[PDB]
Paper text:
The heterotrimeric RNA-dependent RNA polymerase (RdRp) of influenza virus is composed of subunits PA, PB1 and PB2. It is responsible for replication and transcription of the segmented, single-stranded viral RNA genome (vRNA) in the nucleus of infected cells. Transcription of viral mRNAs occurs through a unique “cap-snatching” mechanism. We initially screened metal-chelating compounds by CEN enzymatic assays, followed by a cellular phenotypic screen and then optimized the chemical structure to improve the pharmacokinetics and safety. This culminated in the generation of the compounds BXA and BXM that target the CEN in the PA proteins of influenza A and B viruses.
All four PA-BXA co-crystal structures exhibit clear and unambiguous electron density for the compound, which is bound in essentially the identical fashion in each structure. BXA has a butterfly like form, with one wing comprising a metal chelating polar oxazino-pyridotriazin-dione head-group and the other wing, a lipophilic, difluoro-dihydro-dibenzothiepine tail-group that makes van der Waals contacts with certain residues of the active site pocket. As expected, the head-group binds to the two divalent cations in the endonuclease active center, each metal ion having octahedral co-ordination through interactions with the protein, to the compound or water molecules, as previously described. In FluB wild-type, very similar interactions are made but with slightly different residues Thr20, Phe24, Met34, Asn37 and Ile38. The reduced size of Phe24 compared with Tyr24 allows Arg85 to change conformation and contact the compound in FluB but not FluA. Conserved Ile38 intimately packs into the V of the tail-group in identical fashion in both FluA and FluB, making van der Waals contacts via its CG1 and CD1 atoms. For the wild-type FluB endonuclease, the I38 side-chain conformation does not change upon ligand binding. In the absence of BXA, the Tm of all four endonuclease constructs is 46–50 °C. BXA binding to the endonuclease increases very significantly its thermal stability, with the Tm for the wild-type FluA or FluB endonuclease shifting to 78 or 77 °C, respectively, corresponding to ΔTm of +32 and +29 °C, respectively.
Residue numbers in the entry: -1 to 62, 72 to 192
Write the structure that this text describes.
Amino acid sequence: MAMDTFITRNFQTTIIQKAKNTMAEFSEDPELQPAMLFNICVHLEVCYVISDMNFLDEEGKSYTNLRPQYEVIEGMPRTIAWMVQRSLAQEHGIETPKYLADLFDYKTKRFIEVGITKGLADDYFWKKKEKLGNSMELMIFSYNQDYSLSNESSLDEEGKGRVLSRLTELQAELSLKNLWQVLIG
Ligand SMILES: O=C1c2c(O)c(=O)ccn2N([C@@H]2c3ccccc3SCc3c2ccc(F)c3F)[C@@H]2COCCN12
Ligand SMILES: [Mn+2]
Ligand SMILES: [Mn+2]
């Protein structure tokens, strides 16, 4: 039971193809980098869990007529993603961040960096913060039901819970299949 089989059984094809495309863009081979493949898949999966469950009307009121609260920037070629990020910044009268974000939040008009860690969410928050400063909001999640967020009006309680349930579900299935070892190494 190898990582490639695991990925096929546990991720949607849209997620898998975007992850593999990203790896190919950076000249990395999914067959030779199975930990990396899983990590990219789960990160993109989280971006979509967040984007697929959060909506706005014209007033800007939240629901779980409607438009998505978030646009996913991750999982497209960087040539395209830079156009998207600059376009969204300029459209909303905000600075274009110098780093390529993961999401754009139409509610708050902020870019978001998503981080997944097998360590302490806090620690990873502060690493990304040291680099990104005030340029973007941060959403950091761990496998052990921890998280660290940079602002009040970002993800709600149910959204936090759904991200964390999914990560916990994936870790459980990896451990069941003796593949969690692969990520630790
Ligand atoms: O955008 C990302 C990125 C993130 O957004 C992130 O949260 C963590 C890590 N990232 N990196 C991802 C990535 C994304 C998700 C999970 C693990 C990895 S591991 C390094 C790596 C990435 C992509 C291709 C590749 F060949 C890599 F080696 C690169 C960092 O340089 C900018 C693009 N990018
Ligand atoms: Mn990214
Ligand atoms: Mn990220």
